[PDB]
Amino acid sequence: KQFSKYVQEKTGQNLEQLSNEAIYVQLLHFVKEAAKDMPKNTSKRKVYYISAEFLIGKLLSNNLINLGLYKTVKDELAAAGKSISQVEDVELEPSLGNGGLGRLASCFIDSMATLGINGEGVGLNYHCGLFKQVFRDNQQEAEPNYWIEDDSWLVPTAISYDVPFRDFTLKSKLDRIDILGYHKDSKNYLNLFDIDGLDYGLIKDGITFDKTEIKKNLTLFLYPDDSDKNGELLRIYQQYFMVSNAAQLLIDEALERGSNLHDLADYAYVQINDTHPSMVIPELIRLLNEKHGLDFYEAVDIVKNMIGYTNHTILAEALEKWPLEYLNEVVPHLVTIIEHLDRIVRSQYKDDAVQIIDRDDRVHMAHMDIHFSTSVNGVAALHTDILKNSELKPFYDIYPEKFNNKTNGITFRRWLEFANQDLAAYIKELIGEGYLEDATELEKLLAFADDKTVHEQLAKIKFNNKLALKRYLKENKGINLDENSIIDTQIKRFHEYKRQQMNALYVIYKYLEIKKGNLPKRKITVIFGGKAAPAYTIAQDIIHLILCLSELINNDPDVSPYLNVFLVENYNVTVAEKLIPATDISEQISLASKEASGTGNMKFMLNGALTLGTMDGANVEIAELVGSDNIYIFGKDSDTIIDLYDKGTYVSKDYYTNNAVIKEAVDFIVSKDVLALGKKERLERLYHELINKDWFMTLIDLKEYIAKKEEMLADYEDQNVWNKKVIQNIAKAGFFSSDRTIQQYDKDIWHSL
Fold this sequence. Notes:
The PDB classes it as transferase. Keywords: glycogen phosphorylase activity, transferase. It forms a monomeric assembly. Crystal structure of putative glycogen phosphorylase from Streptococcus mutans. By secondary structure, the chain is α/β, with parallel strands linked by helices. It is 46% helix and 13% strand. The chain is built from 31 helices and 21 strands. A nine-stranded mixed sheet has the order 5-8-9-2-1-10-11-14-15. A six-stranded parallel sheet has the order 18-17-16-19-20-21, sandwiched between helices. A two-stranded antiparallel ribbon has the order 3-4. Helix 19 runs parallel beside helix 20 (537-554) and helix 25 packs across helix 26 (660-668).
């Protein structure tokens, strides 16, 4: 009863008589006090992980888990008549990330701490995230995503750096977050840089704000609006700010540890999460050459031997580019250096395709990263091979030695030990506690593949997790979930090629089948989650549809008993932690050539969910690890899509007219029922888009998708066969541990340990 005695100390009261809010605060302090006295990791070569996003999630629970204190606390609260979940709901989720890029960063830094690697992340302390998602009149609106309280996980420091821009120099401030390792005595920091004199008053209506007020807006928003020059410039301010703080920091930290700057490579290595921190290269060079009096060409040799680049993009065309003119507007002094690097490269390599600056004066930040780094890694085996063989071949041809693969991973603490405690205990029950050190020892679960006693338990755990979710959704999302239903979940950002609209077309089908009187064996609950870019009109039309549908569906006594549709508001980490452990069907149905990886896929696999999806991305490795029978793959090959794009012979109108399933679903979008619920403009627009354009081929796989889903649903009805495949999935999920992924980064690239 360590925490109970603590509250008595600091409060003079018992748990029984405190509020959930006051208890959270007390836990906050309890934990920050435990972490404060923990030493750092001491590996001589420190790794620096720079990322423009860290989708880190709530920290209370994970911190407790990593301290080993989570169960005793959960017990003491219940014995006081208090639900931990309600205490957890007090914390606001850090708005420091958006998509898979950020989450990957979080999972990676987590594994760093758990493996005792002296490796810290560096990013920005965004006071509002991408944006807070709010539904009004069946449409997505945006609002600031504030999160920072006075009492938070942010540990203030006294460190400040000057960041020089053309029109001014900015003073930075640094707040750190303790990144704890699983049952470890030493900790890491997450370094988040920021400025004072931030003005929230700029924000006016929605997320609108004056993009030119740099001193007041710098760290307000992640990925601020980009539709105009001024917006673009702000992105540059951001990127350089993050980068300059990072480099200044690592140099200081190197020096403290007795480094002369000639041997910096022995003290520091840098991994840049995509193209956002590319400007760290010429920045480091600047610091060494001008601030520390090192010969320019020596500075270059030193920096290019301690830089690591990670490319998440597939196509080289999509890589980040900057007009020289814009850069001179913001970081002209750096530009000079970047032009020097262009000279070095352009003199040595005759291939015009590898040049940093191109004919139109655009600066290819990726091209810079490749020339002056020791490693360029891909995220997945096929993805890396695409880079080496086509997209980045010009660079492969001269830098064969740099290109390697590093399959993405997820942290098993957050996505198993916490997300699904029930399941976590059961695993240990069956195959022991070894899988904590080695996630591949989940293959011991195979021996129980045919055991009926287990199939019964997994279904029970599944059912309990649905109850855990039902509590949550009711409590925080105003949603009434039916626990006695098949739960089908698609949680991704809204883009045409993610094809949420395909899943919505299936809903319209299933709705029409029920109205015909052809009823499901079991009730189905389709749940969506994710944001759309405010400027992306079609994506917002799609979101609008699905909201019209869930209103139509869930308010029809004839259909309600058989079909529920939900779009959970403001999808994020803590919502995923609830949805995923309660999910039967994992929707991973993006177009065939558009996904490189997909950690979401990897989470569902771990939480006992069967996957329904295309042969692409993480699906590929999954389908390999399990059997073809233990997954429901559909749609066209990657090759077939690419080629069809190449021939330009796809006409979505033909699929519409020729296939009744489709013809009927699409026509329903503008039917009388739906028009009444929603806006004519949106629904009519989306409706003509699918017929006349449909650039990401929603209609191509629809007919087979619907079919494959119905098959999968019917296979649910046998719970011995179903959970046999579930055991197949979970027994092979050990492959996607982020601890394995980091061990590989460290072994091949960083050499920190």
